[PDB]
Amino acid sequence: NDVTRIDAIESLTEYGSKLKFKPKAKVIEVGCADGSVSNILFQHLPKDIELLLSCDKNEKAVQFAKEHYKNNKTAYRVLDIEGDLPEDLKGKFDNFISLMTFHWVPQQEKAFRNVYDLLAEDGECFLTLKSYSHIYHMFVLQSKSRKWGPFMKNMKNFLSPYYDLSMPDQHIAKILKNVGFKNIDVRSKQKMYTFKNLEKFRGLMIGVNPFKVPENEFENYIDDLMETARTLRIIDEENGTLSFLFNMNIVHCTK
Amino acid sequence: NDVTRIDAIESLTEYGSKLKFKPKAKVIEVGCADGSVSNILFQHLPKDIELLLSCDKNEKAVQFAKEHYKNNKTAYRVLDIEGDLPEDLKGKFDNFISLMTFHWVPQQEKAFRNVYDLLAEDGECFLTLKSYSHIYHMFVLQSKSRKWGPFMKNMKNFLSPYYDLSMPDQHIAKILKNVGFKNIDVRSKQKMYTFKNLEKFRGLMIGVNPFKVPENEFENYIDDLMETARTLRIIDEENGTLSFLFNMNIVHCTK
Numbered sequence A, B: 001n002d003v004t005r006i007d008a009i010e011s012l013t014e015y016g017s018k019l020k021f022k023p024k025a026k027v028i029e030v031g032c033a034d035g036s037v038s039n040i041l042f043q044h045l046p047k048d049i050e051l052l053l054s055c056d057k058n059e060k061a062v063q064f065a066k067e068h069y070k071n072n073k074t075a076y077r078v079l080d081i082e083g084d085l086p087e088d089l090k091g092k093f094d095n096f097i098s099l100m101t102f103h104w105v106p107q108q109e110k111a112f113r114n115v116y117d118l119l120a121e122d123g124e125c126f127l128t129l130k131s132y133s134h135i136y137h138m139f140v141l142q143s144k145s146r147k148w149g150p151f152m153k154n155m156k157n158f159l160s161p162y163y164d165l166s167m168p169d170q171h172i173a174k175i176l177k178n179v180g181f182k183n184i185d186v187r188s189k190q191k192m193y194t195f196k197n198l199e200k201f202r203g204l205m206i207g208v209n210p211f212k213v214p215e216n217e218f219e220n221y222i223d224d225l226m227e228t229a230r231t232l233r234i235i236d237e238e239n240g241t242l243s244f245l246f247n248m249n250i251v252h253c254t255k
Ligand SMILES: Nc1ncnc2c1ncn2[C@@H]1O[C@H](CSCC[C@H](N)C(=O)O)[C@@H](O)[C@H]1O
Pocket: A001, A004, A005, A008, A030, A031, A032, A033, A034, A037, A055, A056, A057, A058, A061, A079, A080, A081, A082, A083, A098, A099, A100, A101, A104, A105
């Protein structure tokens, strides 16, 4: 939540001047999770806007957002952007935003067709997503191991679709062009983030981890996962810091 | 070097239409004094240009080229873009080209202000350089061993200056502004390259390796360097194929 939080802010600084909102714009954010990043996003949108609808596949995250982060301008909804859109949303939106979400979506063409179908004419789309990452690579090392590999077979659906692609900016631009977008700008960025608390970090690994292993093996599984960061030598053992690289892709496009 | 070569193509193919030459262009190339990449330039170079001066730091490499290589519209000059230019070359060039070289240049600011000086008014520059790489990262693992650490003191200067920076596009753009370039476009790229046979890859690592070890220990040092690729798990032992990742930056700038 702190990696994506700073990336959210980083991305909206860099692209603030480039992102245009018509007067009284309907904005839809996808992947609002708990809504603490939805709120930061909201403080960066123009006052003029009519609606920020924030969406997540996670019904429990959407409920927490309603309880805590609601105001007269925002509403929340359970929505799978890989699934079929509800009729009343089709064509209603001036601006579509998705920060650090689309790397969780395996069906990229389907999802981008649904972004398109959501937008009114001259809609702008603004996305950020991971390709390569040192975090993912930690999981890839784990999956090689004789012990943990049998429980890590859904690995490709967890990794960014762009983890091992050459020129993912151009693969994305192609999908977008093909779906029917215009003014397609895809830009790749190399990011570095430094963790200062190794206890907090192990917690985030347990948090990001999607593989089910036997309960009795779970502490060992996580121990070996923490060893993969020592293997890549991205832990600094004296000063208790972990600094990890990840590639970001920023998408800006219009209907 | 097939890395450098396959970068050259993708670079110039993705940026050909955008790269502008005038009639009678005086063109300077900074890299290796192998006409290999000068040939692949020539397809993307317009036919009406007057001169191509292809320079390199390496005395032996120039001597060999002017001896053996033969395009009559091509000269070879020993030049160091980290050193102080000869007065005869200042102001004299309409296009500067350097593919996959500037990652070897620690004094980045000195080098871009030399590229600035070599141009005439309205001159254009085209650079590609490496930031983060699995190849670099392999050497970083080696550097951290008790046996080899001592022989690998000079890692800062061997690694790209951008190996571990967040957003090298912004760092490069700033230095370009500060030297006085205009219409500054810097794009980062996530690239992947697959070696088909691992003896050609052992070839390249001896190629790029700058550190001196005792001649009786050298086969042990490279063997241990090859092991780091099994540690990162970028070798597929079933096919004898190694896939690895490298971040690059493409600079397009006008004087
Ligand atoms: N297909 C899909 N449709 C909608 N939400 C999805 C989705 N796939 C994943 N998500 C949700 O998107 C979120 C991505 S986690 C990132 C949180 C937030 N976007 C941020 O910038 O911090 C998760 O809550 C996940 O449940």
